From Swiss-Prot, chain A:
Keyword Ribosomal protein on entry: yes
Protein function: Found on the solvent side of the large subunit.
UniProt similarity note: Belongs to the bacterial ribosomal protein bL34 family.
Organism: Thermus thermophilus (strain ATCC 27634 / DSM 579 / HB8)
Basic residues bias: start-end ranges: 29-49
Phylogenetic placement of the source organism: Bacteria, Thermotogati, Deinococcota, Deinococci, Thermales
Protein name, entry field: Large ribosomal subunit protein bL34
Pfam family, one: Ribosomal_L34
Note: The open reading frame (ORF) for this protein is entirely within the ORF for the RNase P protein (RnaP). The two start codons are separated by four nucleotides.
Swiss-Prot record, chain B:
Organism: Thermus thermophilus (strain ATCC 27634 / DSM 579 / HB8)
Subunit structure: Part of the 50S ribosomal subunit. Forms a bridge to the 30S subunit in the 70S ribosome, contacting the 16S rRNA. May also make transient contacts with protein S6 during translation in the 70S ribosome.
Biased composition annotated in UniProt, kind: Basic residues: 256-272
Family, similarity comment: Belongs to the universal ribosomal protein uL2 family.
Top-level taxon of the source organism: Bacteria
GO cellular component terms attached to this protein's record: large ribosomal subunit
GO annotation (BP), single: cytoplasmic translation
Keyword rRNA-binding found: yes
Biological function: One of the primary rRNA binding proteins. Required for association of the 30S and 50S subunits to form the 70S ribosome, for tRNA binding and peptide bond formation. It has been suggested to have peptidyltransferase activity; this is somewhat controversial. Makes several contacts with the 16S rRNA (forming bridge B7b) in the 70S ribosome.
Region called Disordered, residue ranges: 222-272
Highest classification ranks of the organism: Bacteria, Thermotogati, Deinococcota, Deinococci, Thermales
Protein name, per record: Large ribosomal subunit protein uL2
Listed HAMAP family: Ribosomal_uL2_B (MF_01320_B)
Xref: Pfam families: Ribosomal_L2, Ribosomal_L2_C
Length: 49, 272
RNA sequence: GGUUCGUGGAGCCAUGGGGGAAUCUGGGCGGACCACCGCCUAAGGCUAAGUACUCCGGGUGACCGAUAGCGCACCAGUAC
RNA sequence: GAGCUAGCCCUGGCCAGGGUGAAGCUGGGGUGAGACCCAGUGGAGGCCCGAACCGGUGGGGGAUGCAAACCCCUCGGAUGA
RNA sequence: GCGAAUGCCGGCAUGAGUAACGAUAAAGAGGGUGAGAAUCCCUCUCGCCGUAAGCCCAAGGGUUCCUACGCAAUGGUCGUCAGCGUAGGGUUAGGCGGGACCUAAGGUGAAGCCGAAAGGCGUAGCCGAAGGGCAGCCGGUUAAUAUUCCGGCCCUUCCCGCAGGUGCGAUGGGGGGACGCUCUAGGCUAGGGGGACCGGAGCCAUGGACGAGCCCGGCCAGAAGCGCAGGGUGGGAGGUAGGCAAAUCCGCCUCCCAACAAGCUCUGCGUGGUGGGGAAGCCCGUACGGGUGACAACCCCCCGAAGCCAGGGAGCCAAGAAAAGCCUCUAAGCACAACCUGCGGGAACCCGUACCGCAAACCGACACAGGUGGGCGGGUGCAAGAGCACUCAGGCGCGCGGGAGAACCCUCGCCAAGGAACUCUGCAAGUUGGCCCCGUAACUUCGGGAGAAGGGGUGCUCCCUGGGGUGAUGAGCCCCGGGGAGCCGCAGUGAACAGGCUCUGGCGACUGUUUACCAAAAACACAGCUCUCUGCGAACUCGUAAGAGGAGGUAUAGGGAGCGACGCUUGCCCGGUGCCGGAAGGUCAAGGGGAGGGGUGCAAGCCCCGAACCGAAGCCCCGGUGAACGGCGGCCGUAACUAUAACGGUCCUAAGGUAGCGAAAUUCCUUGUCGGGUAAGUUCCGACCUGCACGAAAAGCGUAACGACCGGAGCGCUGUCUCGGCGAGGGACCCGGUGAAAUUGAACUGGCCGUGAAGAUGCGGCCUACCCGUGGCAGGACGAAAAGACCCCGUGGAGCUUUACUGC
RNA sequence: CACCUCGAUGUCGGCUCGUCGCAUCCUGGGGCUGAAGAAGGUCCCAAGGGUUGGGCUGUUCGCCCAUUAAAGCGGCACGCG
RNA sequence: AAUGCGCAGAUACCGGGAGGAACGCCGAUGGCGAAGGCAGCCACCUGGUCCACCCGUGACGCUGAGGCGCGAAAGCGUGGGGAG
RNA sequence: GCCCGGAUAGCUCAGUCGGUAGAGCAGGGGAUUGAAAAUCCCCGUGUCCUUGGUUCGAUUCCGAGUCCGGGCACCA
């Protein structure tokens, strides 16, 4: 069966990216919380080239 | 005419395709005066604002000349009559003495090698465009400006045409394709003749497929949905409207006039 | 809209719309209104302290004592 | 949150091999001129059979499963919405 | 201060040495190693993939690659092995792919517009790719990289320079790039099949063969120049009022040559100096390569692409990207600049480059019988084929095994006689099945129904014979056939793939779409018909707005609604609701208006209420309108046999159901009543119609053709059945290894009659009964599972409706 | 009526397997009779064992076809998922 | 007579504009046509028919099953049009 | 089965706070006609469904019923 998780690095950085979060007052508050909460990773860790 | 097919396949039985005999040695359009890329997309920024649009062959817009007035006096030769998927009418490609090339929504009768031209000067004959105030009251005429220097906007959808009824000063009474009698400005240009391809209205698509090729998606009947969706929705084994026939949105769709009354546009019209 | 004030006799202070003054014998207010009697000066701006809070440092505790105490006394917001 | 699912937009890719034989042509015949009727060429089609691919009709099996929808046999579509 | 909250956390039990151990592709043995090996290594047998279970690329993953040490744990067993632990190595470009290029949707966004704030739009530009553009192929080496290192040959850019050409010169003009689907021609190539020819280590086995025997191999790359296919392309000279400057460029006119060409060009394919590869077998050989085989040969035929020349050709309608590179044109500028063409020498960055990659390394909590895009994907045979059988290369036997040889289950095979009697239903399973040739009915929209139905042939041997394509008009090679004799079996598409067929109803015209995870349908859609709104800053939709979709559309067009191919049709009622038209009237809110009255002042005043009357839309009222919401009768009496009732009477209305259908997907009474099929028919088909309660675009009645739709017949065939039997394998069972689960008040948990909250193992009486297991069956433990999904109750909640209320 | 069960007692019919009751359908006895005989009617004993296969409908039932010694009725949570 | 139309102002009259259809008088028992039919005016395309001269061919004629064409009105299809 | 409504001249119906009840047709006598219709002119007629009761008095008001017509008969 075709499931719900089809990995795509572009789609990730694009969707949950840092520059992504930073553009929307909504995404800016996410980073804000994650920081307060101590989250080691503020954005979904993902690497390409 | 209009080609017809033999029932060598159901749906091929009733399908009729227009005939492109008056399509001149063209077929492909001249990349120059058109074609511009044509942005397809069935909605505005975000949501769809017009249901059932989408799919349908790739198209190339043909930037056509809807105000032949730029070239007053400059004549031009009817060089060709091309096919134009962005409209029902056929378009006439014409080379001007000027060396300039443009397309005019090909009028009916218009023909290859013919010479046309626009202006007050222009001779009242199929092809020529002039302000309405010079077109001999009574003659039929297509592609008409609604307001001066604002670009032709009436009659131009195949077999369409308007007719001069008479004048009342700066205005001339016209009878548009609607049967509406409206006063239009005299300085408003109008090219004489009657669009053409008056047979268009007789093509029988033949199969759902054809509507699809035209970017026309399946249209769902209201009563045939659930009440969450449409005024006509639910009930059970079929069902009559059960209330004044409505639209997904609620407005009665059988009689209820939508034209807003206090529009300045009136006082220039007289029944439809 | 604010005030205890939910039209209430509903003033006062705010203001979106229309109308639209005056300079001190001018003008606002004392709960409709009017008259006396009084208070006060609008339509520019600033102003310590007394007040609030605790990320942070300290002292204390008829506060807990590793299922308690912060979610973590343990490389914990980590693993997952 | 549309990296599942639904729709659309942009740009690319894919569809074994068989069959049927439309229109048009071309020749012949026909007539005043024609319609038209024969051959042949022709290659049309939400056309036919059938892989891939896309499905998921009927039955069986599975039922703390290989699997939170699977497997087997059988069926649907397969140049087209 | 806890025994209970289907309490929470943790721990440990029960079921239990039980079910399992993840595709029924399969194993066996001999040697190694080793504390220990069914399970690791090697060899030899055997089976299994092969349009793959084999290769290469992209994504994703990220060291899982290789190597040396290792086994606790992880690998459903074992493990000396590992994709597992420790450590060490390993992934090297100017030309490959991204980037120092271009633009697509879409993002972002100078102007500018809009929003209470956040923020929302937005001509350019910028960003944005597997699209356009762009310079390398063949070999060789590593344990592990290679179009990256090495060798051969071949290219691209930039900077400087020398030489020779030229008005050089843009982010600007122009051209080009540049484009659909289907079908295709001519040459090539990839790929493959032959060889009486060439190069090969060997082999003659068991009856025969030393034979023009068997087995192996007979290639690859390659600048210039040549060839051979093609693809691109007119050349001149004049005018010029267009391409928002200019043009010598395009574009227009005019004349001069050429003209199904040539020339110029640009690809591709051959050939090419030359470089490189180079089996089988046999010997070392752990491994797992190396040698030898060679100074290997490297040649001739034939089949031949869905690939190449390619922007080739034809036809069709649904009429099929942009931008840069690249040419050409000129503006400023500069013309001791500058380009262009040669030829030298220099310069040439960043990132990826390991490995898995239809999977044990990606998505599915697992080394999960699932999902995952592109290219290659040999041979033979069967008409073809990417099908089916076997098999190359290559890769596997799926990570528990050994025995048994019960029930029962799974998948499977055969069966006497009969055959659908089985059942809701011939559900299932059978029958039929390929190709060639006969030959096929109603009805029909002339296509179709057709593969209708129903038959016949199909193997092999010998003789004769007709055509083609390739060689040259013969030879060989391939590709289609015709005929004439004869052979053998039960059987010739001798295996595998590959329709059971009729007759007749219902619904839907048809191909399509749907409830991902119980419905594929008579449902949705669909061409087509009608109604209605919309004159364009359209109507309508999204948005507070700007803005946008509609549409760069303009009534032969857009939106809404309903029907729903097509044929014949689509009656009557606008009285209530709706919508449309009514510059009169009645009513009607702020508002204008002030008759009149009031409160206070000594008063001027100041503040208050407030009748006429003038005040919209809406409503009332007058009209219209049905493919607008909707509606479309009752009771009596009548004909000279009866019966009925053409006719009559009278109430009822807005009018009183027309045609056509009718016990119907609609009929209650009803298996209605006659016919038909049947030995027998609540079903079915034809009828008749007191049609409980059809009926004309929520269409009516038909209809060819379609239907994995639903009903009723019949023929064929059968284990569906009478009625079962036997047999196969995977399980079940036994042995060794590993080892769960829901459940569980606790148990020392028999039967009958009674009793008991009214169905007791647990109470009474009586009867039975030594203790404990194993394989089975499922009546009970009101057995498990889900604090019933029905019902009702909560002044519980949600979704939906409307002439409920109140609001926006 | 609503007493156990709504923290679940699966609720028609068929199939399979039955087992029991008797208020007996058959067969065995027996008294009557408007019982000549053979057939019956009727009632009393008596289940020990028998109690057919089809068509129609989901049917239970029922109606038919063809037979039969007969083609019994009923209870077992309208016995039995 | 009643429907119906008319003070929300009809009828009657005047002016303007739209549209469709048929064409007064001439028209006559008239004419043309093979029949059906054909009537305001104009232009073009075209058939048939009579006369005079008696010039040319030289019987090439008549009819005509079947075929083919035409064929009022109503009616049917697709679209348009719509005053009476 | 539960609820609503109707039961007035021979047929089809109208009507009444209560009190001498009508219409159309049918039917009866005349007239017109040669004679039937049509058409004139004259006419009754109704124990106002039954049964209890209220009232001074009911077909007219109330209860029960009888037959007829209409609606409901669901989750089961
Ligand atoms: Mg996806
Ligand atoms: Mg990506
Ligand atoms: Mg993506
Ligand atoms: Mg840290
Ligand atoms: Mg980050
Ligand atoms: Mg990474
Ligand atoms: Mg069709
Ligand atoms: Mg083209
Ligand atoms: Mg938009
Ligand atoms: Mg946008
Ligand atoms: Mg957006
Ligand atoms: Mg929306
Ligand atoms: Mg266009
Ligand atoms: Mg047009
Ligand atoms: Mg169009
Ligand atoms: Mg004029
Ligand atoms: Mg629809
Ligand atoms: Mg629905
Ligand atoms: Mg609704
Ligand atoms: Mg919704
Ligand atoms: Mg609604
Ligand atoms: Mg509805
Ligand atoms: Mg409805
Ligand atoms: Mg529903
Ligand atoms: Mg219904
Ligand atoms: Mg309704
Ligand atoms: Mg509206
Ligand atoms: Mg206007
Ligand atoms: Mg109109
Ligand atoms: Mg209108
Ligand atoms: Mg209040
Ligand atoms: Mg108060
Ligand atoms: Mg007040
Ligand atoms: Mg107040
Ligand atoms: Mg106030
Ligand atoms: Mg005050
Ligand atoms: Mg204010
Ligand atoms: Mg203010
Ligand atoms: Mg004023
Ligand atoms: Mg003062
Ligand atoms: Mg003063
Ligand atoms: Mg003073
Ligand atoms: Mg003063
Ligand atoms: Mg003062
Ligand atoms: Mg104040
Ligand atoms: Mg005051
Ligand atoms: Mg005060
Ligand atoms: Mg006071
Ligand atoms: Mg004060
Ligand atoms: Mg002041
Ligand atoms: Mg600080
Ligand atoms: Mg501090
Ligand atoms: Mg502190
Ligand atoms: Mg303590
Ligand atoms: Mg602890
Ligand atoms: Mg803790
Ligand atoms: Mg502890
Ligand atoms: Mg802390
Ligand atoms: Mg904790
Ligand atoms: Mg600490
Ligand atoms: Mg500490
Ligand atoms: Mg740590
Ligand atoms: Mg998506
Ligand atoms: Mg997606
Ligand atoms: Mg031919
Ligand atoms: Mg097809
Ligand atoms: Mg299935
Ligand atoms: Mg299925
Ligand atoms: Mg089961
Ligand atoms: Mg299992
Ligand atoms: Mg098929
Ligand atoms: Mg307790
Ligand atoms: Mg507990
Ligand atoms: Mg529990
Ligand atoms: Mg145990
Ligand atoms: Mg075991
Ligand atoms: Mg057990
Ligand atoms: Mg298991
Ligand atoms: Mg396994
Ligand atoms: Mg050794
Ligand atoms: Mg040893
Ligand atoms: Mg193969
Ligand atoms: Mg295959
Ligand atoms: Mg990684
Ligand atoms: Mg490693
Ligand atoms: Mg490696
Ligand atoms: Mg490697
Ligand atoms: Mg070690
Ligand atoms: Mg070791
Ligand atoms: Mg170990
Ligand atoms: Mg281990
Ligand atoms: Mg260790
Ligand atoms: Mg393991
Ligand atoms: Mg495992
Ligand atoms: Mg060892
Ligand atoms: Mg390894
Ligand atoms: Mg390099
Ligand atoms: Mg290199
Ligand atoms: Mg290089
Ligand atoms: Mg750089
Ligand atoms: Mg650079
Ligand atoms: Mg760019
Ligand atoms: Mg750019
Ligand atoms: Mg991009
Ligand atoms: Mg790219
Ligand atoms: Mg392209
Ligand atoms: Mg590319
Ligand atoms: Mg490159
Ligand atoms: Mg190269
Ligand atoms: Mg090499
Ligand atoms: Mg090596
Ligand atoms: Mg290496
Ligand atoms: Mg290499
Ligand atoms: Mg290579
Ligand atoms: Mg190296
Ligand atoms: Mg020099
Ligand atoms: Mg020089
Ligand atoms: Mg030059
Ligand atoms: Mg110069
Ligand atoms: Mg130049
Ligand atoms: Mg340039
Ligand atoms: Mg340039
Ligand atoms: Mg250009
Ligand atoms: Mg093609
Ligand atoms: Mg080659
Ligand atoms: Mg070859
Ligand atoms: Mg071959
Ligand atoms: Mg030798
Ligand atoms: Mg021998
Ligand atoms: Mg031998
Ligand atoms: Mg021998
Ligand atoms: Mg022999
Ligand atoms: Mg030989
Ligand atoms: Mg210029
Ligand atoms: Mg010329
Ligand atoms: Mg070698
Ligand atoms: Mg050698
Ligand atoms: Mg040699
Ligand atoms: Mg190109
Ligand atoms: Mg360009
Ligand atoms: Mg200059
Ligand atoms: Mg310069
Ligand atoms: Mg140049
Ligand atoms: Mg040189
Ligand atoms: Mg450089
Ligand atoms: Mg750089
Ligand atoms: Mg590499
Ligand atoms: Mg690599
Ligand atoms: Mg590496
Ligand atoms: Mg790899
Ligand atoms: Mg692997
Ligand atoms: Mg690989
Ligand atoms: Mg796969
Ligand atoms: Mg696979
Ligand atoms: Mg693949
Ligand atoms: Mg998998
Ligand atoms: Mg495994
Ligand atoms: Mg072979
Ligand atoms: Mg063969
Ligand atoms: Mg084959
Ligand atoms: Mg075949
Ligand atoms: Mg095989
Ligand atoms: Mg055993
Ligand atoms: Mg199996
Ligand atoms: Mg048998
Ligand atoms: Mg049979
Ligand atoms: Mg038989
Ligand atoms: Mg077969
Ligand atoms: Mg067979
Ligand atoms: Mg027949
Ligand atoms: Mg048929
Ligand atoms: Mg058939
Ligand atoms: Mg043989
Ligand atoms: Mg034989
Ligand atoms: Mg076969
Ligand atoms: Mg055969
Ligand atoms: Mg078949
Ligand atoms: Mg259908
Ligand atoms: Mg349809
Ligand atoms: Mg279908
Ligand atoms: Mg489903
Ligand atoms: Mg289907
Ligand atoms: Mg549907
Ligand atoms: Mg539909
Ligand atoms: Mg229609
Ligand atoms: Mg229709
Ligand atoms: Mg929007
Ligand atoms: Mg647009
Ligand atoms: Mg419908
Ligand atoms: Mg028909
Ligand atoms: Mg009405
Ligand atoms: Mg009306
Ligand atoms: Mg109405
Ligand atoms: Mg009306
Ligand atoms: Mg009015
Ligand atoms: Mg007054
Ligand atoms: Mg008063
Ligand atoms: Mg007064
Ligand atoms: Mg006073
Ligand atoms: Mg005074
Ligand atoms: Mg007043
Ligand atoms: Mg009004
Ligand atoms: Mg209607
Ligand atoms: Mg109708
Ligand atoms: Mg209407
Ligand atoms: Mg009667
Ligand atoms: Mg009727
Ligand atoms: Mg019918
Ligand atoms: Mg009937
Ligand atoms: Mg019947
Ligand atoms: Mg019957
Ligand atoms: Mg009969
Ligand atoms: Mg019958
Ligand atoms: Mg009816
Ligand atoms: Mg109707
Ligand atoms: Mg209707
Ligand atoms: Mg019908
Ligand atoms: Mg039909
Ligand atoms: Mg289908
Ligand atoms: Mg179907
Ligand atoms: Mg069987
Ligand atoms: Mg059996
Ligand atoms: Mg056996
Ligand atoms: Mg067995
Ligand atoms: Mg008991
Ligand atoms: Mg006891
Ligand atoms: Mg007891
Ligand atoms: Mg047992
Ligand atoms: Mg049990
Ligand atoms: Mg409960
Ligand atoms: Mg539910
Ligand atoms: Mg309540
Ligand atoms: Mg409530
Ligand atoms: Mg709602
Ligand atoms: Mg219970
Ligand atoms: Mg219960
Ligand atoms: Mg319980
Ligand atoms: Mg129960
Ligand atoms: Mg049945
Ligand atoms: Mg019954
Ligand atoms: Mg019972
Ligand atoms: Mg039962
Ligand atoms: Mg069950
Ligand atoms: Mg059952
Ligand atoms: Mg006039
Ligand atoms: Mg006259
Ligand atoms: Mg005549
Ligand atoms: Mg004229
Ligand atoms: Mg004379
Ligand atoms: Mg003569
Ligand atoms: Mg006629
Ligand atoms: Mg007519
Ligand atoms: Mg009566
Ligand atoms: Mg009455
Ligand atoms: Mg009555
Ligand atoms: Mg009488
Ligand atoms: Mg009475
Ligand atoms: Mg219920
Ligand atoms: Mg209900």
């Amino acid at each position: 069966m075709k499931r719900t998780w089809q990995p795509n690095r572009r789609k990730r950085a694009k969707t949950h990216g840092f520059r992504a979060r930073m553009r929307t007052p909504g995404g800016r508050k996410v980073l804000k919380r994650r920081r307060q909460k101590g989250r080691w990773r503020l954005t979904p860790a993902v690497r390409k080239r | 005419a209009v080609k017809k097919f033999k029932p060598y396949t159901p749906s091929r039985r009733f399908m009729t395709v227009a005939d492109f005999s008056e399509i001149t040695k063209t077929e492909p359009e001249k990349s120059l005066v058109k074609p511009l890329k044509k942005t397809g997309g069935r909605n505005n920024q975000g949501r769809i604002t017009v249901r059932f649009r989408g799919g349908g062959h790739k198209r190339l817009y043909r930037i056509i000349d809807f105000k032949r007035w730029d070239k007053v006096g400059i004549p031009a030769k009817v060089a060709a009559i091309e096919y134009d998927p962005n409209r029902s009418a056929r378009i006439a490609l014409l080379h001007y003495v000027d060396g300039e090339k443009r397309y005019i929504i090909a009028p009916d009768g218009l023909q290859v090698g013919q010479q046309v031209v626009a202006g007050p000067d222009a001779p009242i004959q199929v092809g020529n465009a002039l302000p309405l105030r010079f077109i001999p009251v009574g003659t039929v005429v297509h592609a008409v400006e609604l307001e001066p220097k604002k670009g032709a906007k009436l009659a131009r959808a195949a077999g369409t045409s308007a007719q001069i009824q008479g004048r009342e000063g700066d205005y001339v009474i016209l009878r548009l394709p609607s049967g509406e009698l409206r006063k239009v400005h005299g300085e408003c240009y109008a090219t004489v003749g009657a669009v053409g391809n008056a047979d268009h209205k007789n093509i029988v698509l033949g199969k759902a497929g054809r509507s699809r090729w035209l970017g026309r998606r399946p249209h769902v009947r209201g009563a045939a949905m659930n009440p969450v969706d449409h005024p006509h929705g639910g009930g059970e084994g079929r069902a009559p409207r059960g209330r004044p026939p409505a639209s997904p949105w609620g407005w009665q769709t059988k009689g209820l006039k939508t034209r807003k009354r206090r529009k300045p546009s009136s006082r220039f019209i007289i029944a439809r």
